[PDB]
Amino acid sequence: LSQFKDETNPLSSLRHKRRISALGPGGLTRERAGFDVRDVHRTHYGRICPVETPEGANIGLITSLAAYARVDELGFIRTPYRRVVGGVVTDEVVYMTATEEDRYTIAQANTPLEGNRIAAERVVARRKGEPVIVSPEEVEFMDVSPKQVFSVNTNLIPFLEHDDANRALMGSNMQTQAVPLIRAQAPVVMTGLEERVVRDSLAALYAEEDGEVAKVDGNRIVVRYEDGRLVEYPLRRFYRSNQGTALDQRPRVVVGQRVRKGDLLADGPASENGFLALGQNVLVAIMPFDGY
Amino acid sequence: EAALRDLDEEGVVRIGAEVKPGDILVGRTSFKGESEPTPEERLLRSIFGEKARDVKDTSLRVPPGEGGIVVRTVRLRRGDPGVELKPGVREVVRVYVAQKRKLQVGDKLANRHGNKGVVAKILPVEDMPHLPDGTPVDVILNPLGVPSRMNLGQILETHLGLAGYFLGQRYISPIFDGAKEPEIKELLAQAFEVYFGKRKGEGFGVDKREVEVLRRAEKLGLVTPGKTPEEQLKELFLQGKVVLYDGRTGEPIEGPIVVGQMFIMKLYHMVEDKMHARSTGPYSLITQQPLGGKAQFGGQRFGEMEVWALEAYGAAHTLQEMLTLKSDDIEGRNAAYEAII
Amino acid sequence: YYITQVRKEKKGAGLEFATPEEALAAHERGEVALNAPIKVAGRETSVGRLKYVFANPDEALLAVAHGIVDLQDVVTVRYMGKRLETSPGRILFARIVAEAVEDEKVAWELIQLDVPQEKNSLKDLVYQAFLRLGMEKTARLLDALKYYGFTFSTTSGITIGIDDAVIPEEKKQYLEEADRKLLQIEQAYEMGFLTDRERYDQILQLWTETTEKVTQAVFKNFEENYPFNPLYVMAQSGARGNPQQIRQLCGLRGLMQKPSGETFEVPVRSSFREGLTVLEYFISSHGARKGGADTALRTADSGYLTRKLVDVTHEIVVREADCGTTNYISVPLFQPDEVTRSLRLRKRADIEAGLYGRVLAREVEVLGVRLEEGRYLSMDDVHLLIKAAEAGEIQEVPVRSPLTCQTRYGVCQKCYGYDLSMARPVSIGEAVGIVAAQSIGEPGTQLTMRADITQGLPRVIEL
Amino acid sequence: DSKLKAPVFTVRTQGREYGEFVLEPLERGFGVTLGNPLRRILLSSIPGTAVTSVYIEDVLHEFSTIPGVKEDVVEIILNLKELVVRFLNPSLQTVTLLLKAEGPKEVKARDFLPVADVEIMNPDLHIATLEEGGRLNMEVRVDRGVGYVPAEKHGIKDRINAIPVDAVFSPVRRVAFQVEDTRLGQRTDLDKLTLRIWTDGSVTPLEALNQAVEILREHLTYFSNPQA
Amino acid sequence: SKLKAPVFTVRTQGREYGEFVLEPLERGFGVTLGNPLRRILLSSIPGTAVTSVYIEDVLHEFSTIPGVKEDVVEIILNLKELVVRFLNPSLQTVTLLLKAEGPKEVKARDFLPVADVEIMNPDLHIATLEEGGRLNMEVRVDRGVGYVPAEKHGIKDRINAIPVDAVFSPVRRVAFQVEDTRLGQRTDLDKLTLRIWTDGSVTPLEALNQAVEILREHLTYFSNPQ
Amino acid sequence: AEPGIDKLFGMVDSKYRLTVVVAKRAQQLLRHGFKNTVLEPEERPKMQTLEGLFDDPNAVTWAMKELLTGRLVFGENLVPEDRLQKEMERLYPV
Ligand SMILES: [Mg+2]
Ligand SMILES: [Mg+2]
Ligand SMILES: [Mg+2]
Ligand SMILES: [Zn+2]
């Protein structure tokens, strides 16, 4: 379970820390594992991503945690839900385990609402994992968002609902293998998680509080905070990762610029103004060309 | 002196020097030890009057297929604070070499929807298909990869990319709750008014080649008959298709082509890290067979299923060569090399 | 395929005239299209057949360069002394084969002019050229086909757009019909007319029939309205795709299975063009994981089977010309039909797999043709035997087989028969044992790497 | 008659970077016959100038940073590839530009020292940002040539610590041509050709068109001597 | 380091076929030269063709004549393969006369001779007659370029005349090929091969020379602005 | 495809016999420096070099072209093995 760190790009290291393995001491064996342990259970909904897995001898044995899921003190994965009382959806959010979830009727997040009240007369819901059609008065809980069903890598694929599951497995896995580029740019069409991935990877540099930038350089940045202390941030330049890719930080501010709390100071690898940038945007024609 | 040009006085390569395969990174001598010079080498050294030395070359050189620019050198010595060297080790030297890699034939590209492939052809700008305004495309993708894989997300991404190319804007569409075709088609209507409205102001009408393509478009049921050429061109635009010219001939493609903007990533697997070859090299201790692996300069494995293929062909002499002359027949492999030279 | 397919117009499509000049007058008035099927006096023709008459292929292709006609338009051409009614594209295809083989008379007999060139027709062309010309001329023909196929696919204009996945109008009506019948079933169950299992089985049957209706509606819509649709053309020509995958793109996804093997009562009613819901996507993921696990956990069994076959047949070699035996086997041409309790003729492919390239043990007299003993059976001979069986003249064929061969440590040339990779008698010294093991093992491993997990490979391993 | 009269040539220009050229009337099919070869020649075979090597004081290679400078050497070289230099002397083949700046300032292409028969077409191009206490002393070499030559091919180094730079010599930026449906008398199938050329300003569109026509003319003389 | 001037070789066999090779060339110049020449060769080379035919007792093109195997359609098709060369540059249009009695096999040599008119293929088969068969035919030959359908020109010299498609172009077919070649350390060079088919009125080498001159003349139009 | 491969396969009863005949003939040509060839001076295979057109060094190519002419005799138990080599050396010193 102690593994050489994967840091081809900032997203590669974020995924490696969220992986769940059934192997190791006290676990299963790759050769003696049956079909039951490698299958998608109905209780994986909102807790384990159903698509992100390696095809081959490790299929169904190494998985990923869902985006909104969290592990409790006893070690059980929980997912959030919205309380529904009297046909109106509230802002109270409850985290619950799989055994507690089986006692309620939980509606889908795409249920039409007029403000906070359910408008549709027929509601699609789940009862112990099975899809049913119920009236609004029988609904007790609601999904927070469609994003809680999938992991971070799968949440970065736009128009996912139009893609086959087998091909979507390749799309999310291959984003780990993208290399940083000297002119990397953010995609034209995004899903909305690009900013948070960069922020939570600790690869870029942000302002601790409001202040003014005093010194800007390719090696250091000095910021004068409002309370008066001087903080100097050394920048990592031309550093070699475990995979051999070069990791560098480029400053994004000028001398005298005023910055608020949380403002970007320097871009990390594979980032563009705080947005994840794993490639280029190019003009594409879909047509055969002379057998090439 | 040519081989020692880039080394400093301490025997290490200077920072900023360009290194190629066979170049020396750091020089090192070893004591040769005791041995009986062959009788032939005895006469050879006596004729030239050259007294032998007690040391030999054991320096570190660039492996084949590598090289670049020296950027850093690290030196650790015994007794330094925090340096815990193994017993018997005096010092250790580390050298860092950096290279800038451009795209080439054999590199792997992919998008977020699972479409992947290698680069097989790089074309000059005048050979690529271009828009009527003269703008060439960058990447050409085969439509045969879509129907069997059932990944239609790349098609919708291309359509939204085309509208944003002319409107100069980006979009955020959350999964399962985002942009739909009625919303995409209304953005394409605004993009057409700047893609085609600009042409009218400059004083240009409809191309002769565009008229020919529109004539076939209604035969395929793509446009409504009886409309003006401008209206029919707008109908094709709302489907994500434009008239495309061939750079080699100047004639249009006989059918409208889907053109748009897509996000493509460059993958870690590169051909420059995978190509390897070997004629002769290191051998194993017990079996006396060639080692394996590019890092060890090893040979390729001829397994059981490969032997079955030669047997089915009836190539008896080809099979016997790989079993003996090229793997572990020591007398045969020494004689084979001397015969060829 | 693109240049060999002809256009079909529907503007006129039925108008009748009296003289060809009358039909041509209406064409210039915009009433009838060039390829619209019309009747002049008694015969059905088109304007293009009468308006454009070409003396030779050079004139027809020259007019295409000047833009008067397209490759897909049907016209009249004079070629090899015949006043054919074909498109310039099909005339162009005939010239490709003639120049590749450098013989106009033989190449004319090798091709099928009046059909578009699909995967099946191109495979027959290659096999016939091998029989008549040899390896050297067949290799040259293969390169010529590759060169022109790549050239024409670039300039034709094949592309994929979101609107190319055409939704049939009948899908909305079919789904509403299913809902009315579904509600009828539930009412009957509530009144005690049927049990739980009976209700569950009826629901599955209703959705199975509805899915097949949608598949027919998808392809019927393409044929009548969009014959040149990129998805339709790819499946019809055999380039890419099958009807099952086309339905998921344009119709509905269909029923899905639980991890336990049971099927969900509610199917996925949306296609990939419309987009799935979160609940539908999760339900469909159970079967995707199951297919991936079967691929990974069953490639070793297929590979293990191949190794067993090699170790049991590795010593079988063609060691002599003839063993001198008089034993043989009889290959049946008819099989019992247990469902109807009668004898019916076998499939043509099954008969070919047991008779092609085999030495006749005894003399056979069929349809006035004498097949002597010791004659290798070509593909034409097999076809003649099938025709004779359809006339009730023969029921079985005596042939020499390795089962009855008397050669020690192998087989003889006369008992083995043909070298299937060369369409000629097998040469002495070939390791036919290794070839047999590789031939059996290859399809099993390839299929499981892409049914075969059912009583397929497990059934074969048991046998 | 069947032999059409000589077409009239019309030129419309916008400064030194854009131009339009019209040739009408033409016989049917000659718009593509003439327009396409000119576009292919214009986009590939027009000589120009480019930066081929740069030397910066106290810098050993391009994978380093300069104290007091916001940008690193890689970003500086990218900015230098957008520099446009015009040679006023046809016999001139190579020139060297010198820059010496001290912070705090934002250096532009106009901070280069003047050289005779050399003109900078984009003086407002941004090169680097200097912080207080920063210095920038560098020498840039500009050559003349054709096509696209990678730095790995020429490998030009004026001294020990010079850094070779990939060269894009083409001054032409974009070429497009239009074919319209014109008529003359009773003939309605005639062609009208319009050529649109975009350049960087060192070479005007009219000059580039003349050079492309001459290149095509000299190639047609190669069909003269049969060597059977 | 500009490229050396290429070598132009010719392989001409007979009077109707020829191959021409030009190498070495800069990258992409094979397409640059090959495409314009093919377009000019197929549409701009001057030639002669039959534009109208008059046949006695024939009302329409789709009828048949008693006493001859070939119908009106087949006779018209045979006329479109006739090759005629005008010796006099001033001469523009001629009319040929044909009168035959059965059961002879009518050939192209049976036409009455005309001053400054030469028949290139006198062995061409026109029609086959039987006992009691008559064939009184008049054809009109014009000058032009390219290919013109009958419905376009609509030329009739008299009542009941049948216009026929005019195949003016002497060139039958053009096909060019571009191959990758090398010269020392340069590996991106081009080699161009040009193949031309002609009806025999003009040599394939003559057609190539005319096509080059036509393109050269058009390049001089970019001379006097406004 | 090899030139004349269809005709070469029709000269032998077994396809593996053709390979043996070609391989042994190629060894004979290399042993005697192509001085024992049955080809005419205008029939010798050639390769294009920068200096000029020279003889083909590939002996397998020579052997295949010699077999198509029909001036070679092949079979089993033709001549004693020792008598063959000694006679060839005396006729073609090398
Ligand atoms: Mg793997
Ligand atoms: Mg007609
Ligand atoms: Mg420039
Ligand atoms: Zn036998």
Swiss-Prot record, chain A:
Keyword match Nucleotidyltransferase: yes
Reported function: DNA-dependent RNA polymerase catalyzes the transcription of DNA into RNA using the four ribonucleoside triphosphates as substrates.
Homology family: Belongs to the RNA polymerase beta chain family.
Name of the protein described by the UniProt record: DNA-directed RNA polymerase subunit beta
Subunit architecture: The RNAP catalytic core consists of 2 alpha, 1 beta, 1 beta' and 1 omega subunit. When a sigma factor is associated with the core the holoenzyme is formed, which can initiate transcription.
GO molecular function: DNA binding; DNA-directed RNA polymerase activity; ribonucleoside binding
Keywords recorded for this protein, A-Z: DNA-directed RNA polymerase, Nucleotidyltransferase, Transcription, Transferase
Single GO cellular component term: DNA-directed RNA polymerase complex
Organism of this sequence: Thermus thermophilus (strain ATCC 27634 / DSM 579 / HB8)
Biological processes per GO annotation: DNA-templated transcription
Residues of the whole record sequence present: 391 to 682 of 1119
Ion transport keyword on record: no
Swiss-Prot record, chain C:
Binding site for Zn(2+) 2: C323, C405, C412, C415
Summary of subunit composition and partner proteins: The RNAP catalytic core consists of 2 alpha, 1 beta, 1 beta' and 1 omega subunit. When a sigma factor is associated with the core the holoenzyme is formed, which can initiate transcription.
Family: Belongs to the RNA polymerase beta' chain family.
Protein role: DNA-dependent RNA polymerase catalyzes the transcription of DNA into RNA using the four ribonucleoside triphosphates as substrates.
The protein's name: DNA-directed RNA polymerase subunit beta'
Species per Swiss-Prot/TrEMBL record: Thermus thermophilus (strain ATCC 27634 / DSM 579 / HB8)
Gene name in the database record: rpoC
Portion of the full-length sequence here: 790 to 1262 of 1524
From Swiss-Prot, chain D:
UniProt KW Magnesium keyword: no
Functional note: DNA-dependent RNA polymerase catalyzes the transcription of DNA into RNA using the four ribonucleoside triphosphates as substrates.
Entry text on domains: The N-terminal domain is essential for RNAP assembly and basal transcription, whereas the C-terminal domain is involved in interaction with transcriptional regulators and with upstream promoter elements.
GO-annotated molecular function: DNA binding; DNA-directed RNA polymerase activity; protein dimerization activity
Family membership noted in the UniProt record: Belongs to the RNA polymerase alpha chain family.
Record-given protein name: DNA-directed RNA polymerase subunit alpha
Record field: catalytic activity: RNA(n) + a ribonucleoside 5'-triphosphate = RNA(n+1) + diphosphate
Record note on quaternary structure: Homodimer. The RNAP catalytic core consists of 2 alpha, 1 beta, 1 beta' and 1 omega subunit. When a sigma factor is associated with the core the holoenzyme is formed, which can initiate transcription.
Recorded GO CC terms: cytoplasm; DNA-directed RNA polymerase complex
Gene: rpoA
Shown chain mapped onto the complete sequence: 3 to 230 of 315
Start and end residues of each stretch annotated as Alpha N-terminal domain (alpha-NTD): 1-227
GO terms classed as biological process: DNA-templated transcription
Entry's EC annotation: 2.7.7.6
From Swiss-Prot, chain F:
Catalytic activity: RNA(n) + a ribonucleoside 5'-triphosphate = RNA(n+1) + diphosphate
GO biological process assignments: DNA-templated transcription
GO cellular component annotations of the record: DNA-directed RNA polymerase complex
InterPro entries: DNA-dir_RNA_pol_omega, Pol_omega/Rpo6/RPB6, RPB6/omega-like_sf
Gene3D superfamilies, per the entry: 3.90.940.10
GO molecular function, one term: DNA-directed RNA polymerase activity
SMART domains the UniProt entry points to: RNA_pol_Rpb6
Keyword Zinc-finger: no
Transmembrane segments: none
Keywords in alphabetical order: DNA-directed RNA polymerase, Nucleotidyltransferase, Transcription, Transferase
EC id: 2.7.7.6
Quaternary context: The RNAP catalytic core consists of 2 alpha, 1 beta, 1 beta' and 1 omega subunit. When a sigma factor is associated with the core the holoenzyme is formed, which can initiate transcription.
Role, per record: Promotes RNA polymerase assembly. Latches the N- and C-terminal regions of the beta' subunit thereby facilitating its interaction with the beta and alpha subunits.
NCBIfam families, alphabetized: rpoZ
Family classification: Belongs to the RNA polymerase subunit omega family.
UniProt name for this protein: DNA-directed RNA polymerase subunit omega
Taxonomic source organism: Thermus thermophilus (strain ATCC 27634 / DSM 579 / HB8)
Recorded name of the encoding gene: rpoZ
